[PDB]
Write a protein that binds this ligand. Structure first.
Ligand SMILES: *[C@@H]1O[C@H](CO)[C@@H](O[C@@H]2O[C@H](CO)[C@@H](O[C@@H]3O[C@H](CO)[C@@H](O)[C@H](O)[C@@H]3O)[C@H](O)[C@H]2NC(C)=O)[C@H](O)[C@H]1NC(C)=O
Ligand SMILES: *[C@@H]1O[C@H](CO)[C@@H](O[C@@H]2O[C@H](CO)[C@@H](O)[C@H](O)[C@H]2NC(C)=O)[C@H](O)[C@H]1NC(C)=O
Ligand SMILES: *[C@@H]1O[C@H](CO)[C@@H](O[C@@H]2O[C@H](CO)[C@@H](O)[C@H](O)[C@H]2NC(C)=O)[C@H](O)[C@H]1NC(C)=O
Ligand SMILES: O=C(NO)[C@@H](Cc1ccc(F)cc1)C(=O)NCc1ccccc1
Ligand SMILES: *[C@@H]1O[C@H](CO)[C@@H](O)[C@H](O)[C@H]1NC(C)=O
Ligand SMILES: *[C@@H]1O[C@H](CO)[C@@H](O)[C@H](O)[C@H]1NC(C)=O
Ligand SMILES: *[C@@H]1O[C@H](CO)[C@@H](O)[C@H](O)[C@H]1NC(C)=O
Ligand SMILES: *[C@@H]1O[C@H](CO)[C@@H](O)[C@H](O)[C@H]1NC(C)=O
Ligand SMILES: *[C@@H]1O[C@H](CO)[C@@H](O)[C@H](O)[C@H]1NC(C)=O
Ligand SMILES: *[C@@H]1O[C@H](CO)[C@@H](O)[C@H](O)[C@H]1NC(C)=O
Ligand SMILES: [Zn+2]
Length: 910
């Protein structure tokens, strides 16, 4: 089939490279010029051929290839130096061919050199340009890589697949006012004739091309050493060095934890962490040199909040985890990308807990799971492992399914097997697959066949010579059943719904595929129920016993039998499992009255899980909005902030939902209910930074809710801070837990909104900037909102890396959803300039501007617009996902709007 760039048959037909030429080592020399804003470069690839061949296939993109040569030392036809090579392009596969004068030899090593050149990229991918503001008003330039998944090929030609691991030797030629960083430490610096310098770096360990990295910049650092002797450096532009302190501590402590828990030393002399001014993802896990958004890494007590400190701990923890789960062990291909991204997400939980339990990140994890259930309960969801091929289909694989769900599934497991067995299984996995790859099954066989104690040969279990007890019968047997289980969770899209009926001291269990916007008898429903079956490890506790009993489904139905009768049953203890529970008969009722009478009788995660499931079931039509709203009545005595905030979030979301649609009467009663109830808690609240972290997080949430509902004291107190701050011209300090609230109130007048846009450009805290841009985005004046979008498109005052977040900010407010939607449709083509397709930024631009729509009206416009984008060849998965979400909203209103109008009215009466 293939017909290449300038006539002529491209030897290769398939999208994945040929598995016949194996690279081994890369000599790579880069000479970027940052006044010309370009680079020239060169490389030598030591390959090993396995079957004889006359063509060499390798990726490349937007790379002008000057020379091309094949040497060797084991083949005489190719000894130094010749001959030059036949290079042939094919942009449609980002592949090039090397056509060779004469067939090569099985099991012999040849050397592919090549000169190639290009312009510094100008959008977040490959080897690209970035700029920053000094404290003085100066604007400087740096050159950065981001290659994951497939943009190495834009930077130097290579065999871009994660399987093709190789050593990397790297040299960077630079000017004296710049340093240069890469994955490895700097071995040598040679002074040069004109006066340039050339840096050499230790040849890397075996690694994938997407992890290669080099930076050229004038940054500063703070450094510290690990227990195990790793040098750790936090790099940041010079007038910001002192926002790198927390990162230094956190990384050191976290890297120390990771070596212990994994029982594998981080393998490299140094570990650099650099905050990049223009960075599209939040961070990139480059072995030896991790890159970060400024907001993901820097921290400043005067102006960052405690949720910010929690976000920086999170992201640092996520990255450093990747050094094992991703860099040391890498996914065989992008279908199992979750072996990378699921584990890093989940190891956040573990490592942040272990190293910083005063951050309470253990509570907040349930949020990871609730967020993915949203998407996982629509039919436009996917299995965590599905095939992938296009650059676009690979980027798409990076979503809350491969991240959050993988983390959740894995957390389930940890509960089932217990920490000690889980941990043991991980340490095996990593040791076994060090410096190479794994596919899904590898991860389970290891987690399955995990080992204890080790108990020292003499009994047994794990050794060359273990005995054969009546335990070894099930060790090899139960472990093999754990594997049969997880394979369900990785191959089947969706999430199971357990139904629990309590007639007698016996419990009947049914199992279904939980779906939202689809009642137990729509026409839709049966088809979606078809083949689905899970291996759900369940737990439960009763009122008569706070003992944790465990049991495993089994098929569509099953029956357990309690000791004694009891008031209530409560399945999924702490909701450590990936299933929704529905209680039939009087189940919800008993459980609810139990909350109002003595809620401490239920574990506080049980409370969070119950609140979550009760509202989720309303959506699936197995419950009515009144039973759920009824269960919020207990919140007035609730003291665990997880449970309060979760409950408040459902009420706060209904309000915002009603506000969009101009349903003033429900909007206004809802406002009234929230302020009159919850008035005790709203008012126990300092405008301070005092208290723990859930305390601080409660204060922000409750103080926001008050100011969102124009509760005049709260509005007055806020504005009375903004005034003192604007007059003192910054010399006065606003607590960080209220910064966003005060700015938002302040931004309601043109005097305020102006002063704030000003402070935006001057700020050295990228976190304060974050808060200011939110406040700015809450003006009513549509002129101002539009200025913000404009500015953000230019990319000068407001970086374009911020634009998706700001369209979403604007869109979710009533005075800005039309503007946002109009803008996205009228500037689509321009947005495809600025961003991939592909990108995270495009997906947040699409769904942050449409997914909150709730009218068949809006559903109409969005459905066309997507179809308009279809044909042009723009297909994303976010298209169906969004439309399925808009519809879920519409059905929800259809089936529950009256019931919400009435519940409130009733309440007013009582
Ligand atoms: C490409 O990376 C591989 C690893 O992925 C490098 O292999 C490593 O280097 C040598 C093997 O030649 C081994 O060195 C060991 O180090 C200690 C001192 O720390 C020394 O005393 C021992 O006697 C031993 O030689 C090391 O075990 C090995 N590691 C692995 C995992 O294979 C290889 O060097 C790299 N290739 C190039 C060209 O740099
Ligand atoms: C990048 O290119 C610029 C010019 O294209 C180089 O700057 C010149 O360097 C020469 C000798 O090194 C000086 O005599 C000139 O005065 C420089 N020009 C200016 C405008 O200052 C620069 O050295 C190159 N850098 C690299 C790393 O290649
Ligand atoms: C988070 O950390 C805490 C404490 O570090 C773990 O909680 C348990 O603490 C008690 C102390 O009385 C002990 O049973 C163990 O240290 C911990 N439990 C177990 C079963 O080992 C908690 O397990 C951690 N959370 C996660 C998800 O690992
Ligand atoms: O996983 C991460 N670094 O490894 C980054 C994002 C990233 C995206 C694509 C890449 F190729 C590399 C990194 C992250 O935490 N991102 C936030 C996020 C949340 C949910 C889905 C996707 C991203
Ligand atoms: C490559 O060689 C192996 C045997 O060494 C065999 O599969 C066949 O001859 C070749 N296969 C391909 C796909 O070229
Ligand atoms: C590249 O080709 C030019 C053309 O003559 C030659 O002079 C030069 O030596 C070549 N360089 C490399 C690195 O192959
Ligand atoms: C910045 O560094 C200075 C020392 O130059 C230090 O006193 C200060 O605490 C750091 N933080 C800020 C926000 O300036
Ligand atoms: C549900 O998903 C499957 C798999 O993508 C698809 O074939 C089917 O058409 C979908 N049905 C509906 C009603 O969305
Ligand atoms: C709730 O139950 C516990 C357990 O006995 C008890 O200590 C507490 O006083 C009870 N509170 C109420 C209001 O019943
Ligand atoms: C809400 O509806 C009323 C009904 O006439 C209308 O006058 C008002 O402008 C609407 N408000 C918004 C914000 O659309
Ligand atoms: Zn990650």
């Amino acid at each position: 089939f293939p017909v290449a760039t300038n006539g002529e048959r491209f030897p290769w037909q398939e999208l994945r490279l040929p598995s016949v030429v194996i690279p081994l080592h890369y000599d790579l020399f880069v000479h970027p010029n940052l006044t010309s804003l370009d680079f020239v470069a060169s490389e030598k690839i030591e390959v090993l051929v396995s079957n004889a061949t006359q063509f060499i296939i390798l990726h490349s993109k937007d790379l002008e290839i000057t020379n091309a040569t094949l040497q060797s030392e084991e083949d005489s036809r190719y000894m130094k130096p010749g001959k030059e090579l036949k290079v042939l392009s094919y942009p449609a596969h980002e592949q090039i061919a090397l056509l060779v004068p004469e067939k090569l030899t099985p099991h012999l090593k040849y050397y592919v050199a090549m000169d190639f050149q290009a312009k510094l990229g100008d959008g977040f991918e490959g080897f690209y340009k970035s700029t920053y503001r000094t404290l003085g008003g100066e604007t400087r330039i740096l050159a950065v890589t981001d290659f994951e998944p497939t943009q190495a090929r834009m930077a130097f030609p290579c065999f871009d697949e994660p399987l093709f691991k190789a050593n990397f030797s790297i040299k960077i030629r630079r000017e004296s006012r710049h340093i240069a960083l890469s994955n490895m430490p700097k071995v040598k610096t040679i002074e040069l004739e004109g006066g340039l310098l050339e840096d050499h770096f230790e040849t890397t360990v075996k690694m994938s091309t997407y992890l290669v990295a080099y930076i050229v910049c004038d940054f500063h650092s703070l450094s510290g050493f690990t227990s195990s002797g790793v040098k750790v450096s936090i790099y940041a532009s010079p007038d910001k060095r002192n926002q790198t302190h927390y990162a230094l501590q956190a990384s050191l402590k976290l890297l120390d934890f990771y070596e212990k828990y994994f029982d594998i030393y981080y393998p490299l002399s140094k570990l650099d962490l650099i905050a990049i001014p223009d960075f599209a993802p939040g961070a990139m896990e480059n072995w030896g040199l991790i890159t970060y958004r400024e907001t993901s890494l820097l921290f400043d007590p005067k102006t960052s909040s405690a949720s910010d400190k929690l976000w920086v701990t999170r992201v640092i923890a996520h990255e450093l985890a990747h050094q094992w789960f991703g860099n040391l062990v890498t996914m065989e291909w992008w279908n199992d990308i979750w072996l990378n991204e699921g584990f890093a997400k989940y190891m956040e939980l573990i490592a942040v807990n272990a190293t910083y339990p005063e951050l309470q990140f253990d509570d907040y994890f349930l949020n990871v799971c609730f967020e993915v259930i949203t998407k996982d309960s629509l039919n436009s969801s996917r299995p965590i492992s599905k095939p992938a091929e296009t650059p676009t289909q690979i980027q798409e694989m990076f979503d809350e399914v491969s991240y959050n769900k993988g983390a959740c599934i894995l957390n389930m497991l940890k509960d089932f097997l217990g920490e000690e067995k889980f941990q043991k299984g991980i340490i095996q996995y990593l040791k076994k697959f060090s410096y190479r790859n794994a596919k899904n099954d590898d991860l389970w066989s290891s987690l399955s066949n995990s080992c204890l104690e080790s108990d020292f040969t003499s009994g047994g279990v794990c050794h060359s010579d273990p005995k054969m007890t009546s335990n070894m019968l099930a060790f090899l047997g139960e472990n093999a059943e754990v594997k049969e289980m997880m394979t369900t969770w990785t191959l089947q899209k969706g999430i199971p719904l357990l139904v629990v009926k309590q007639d007698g001291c016996s419990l009947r269990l049914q199992q279904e595929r939980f779906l939202q916007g689809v009642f137990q008898e729509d026409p839709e429903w049966r088809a979606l129920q078809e083949r689905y079956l899970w291996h759900i490890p369940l737990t439960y506790s009763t009122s008569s016993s706070n003992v944790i009993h465990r049991h495993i489904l089994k098929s569509k139905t099953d029956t357990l039998d309690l000791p004694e009768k009891t008031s209530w049953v409560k399945f999924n203890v702490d909701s450590n499992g990936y299933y929704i529970v529905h209680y039939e008969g009087h189940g919800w009722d008993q459980l609810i009255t139990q909350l109002n009478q003595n809620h401490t009788l239920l574990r506080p995660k049980d409370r969070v899980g119950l609140i979550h499931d009760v509202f989720q079931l309303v959506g699936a039509g197995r419950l009515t909005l009144d039973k759920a709203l009824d269960m919020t009545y207990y919140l007035q005595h609730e003291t665990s902030s997880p449970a309060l905030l979760e409950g408040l979030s459902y009420l706060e979301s209904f309000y915002h939902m009603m506000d969009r649609r101009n349903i003033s009467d429900i909007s206004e009663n809802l406002k009234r209910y929230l302020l009159q109830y919850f008035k005790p808690v709203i008012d126990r609240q300092s405008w301070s930074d005092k208290g723990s972290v859930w305390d601080r997080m409660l204060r922000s949430a409750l103080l926001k809710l008050a100011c969102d509902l124009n509760h005049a004291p709260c509005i007055q107190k806020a504005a009375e801070l903004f005034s003192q701050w604007m007059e003192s011209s910054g010399k006065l300090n606003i607590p960080t837990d209220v910064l966003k609230i005060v700015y938002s109130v302040g931004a309601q007048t043109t005097a305020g909104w102006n002063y704030l846009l000003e402070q935006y450009e001057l700020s050295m805290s990228s976190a304060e900037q974050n808060k200011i841009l939110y406040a700015l985005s809450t003006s009513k004046h549509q002129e101002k909102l539009l200025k913000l979008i404009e500015l953000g498109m230019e990319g000068k005052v407001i970086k374009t890396q911020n634009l998706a977040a700001l369209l979403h900010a604007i869109a979710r407010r009533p005075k800005g959803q039309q503007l946002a939607w109009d803008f996205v449709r009228e500037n689509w083509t321009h947005l495809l300039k600025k961003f991939d397709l592909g990108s995270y930024d495009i997906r947040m631009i699409i769904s942050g501007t449409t997914a909150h729509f709730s009218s068949k009206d809006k559903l109409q416009e969005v459905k066309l617009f997507f179809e308009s984008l279809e044909a042009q060849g723009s297909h994303l998965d976010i298209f169906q996902t969004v439309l399925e979400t808009i519809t879920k909203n519409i059905k929800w209103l259809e089936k529950n709007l009256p019931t919400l109008r009435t519940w409130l009215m009733v309440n007013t009466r009582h």
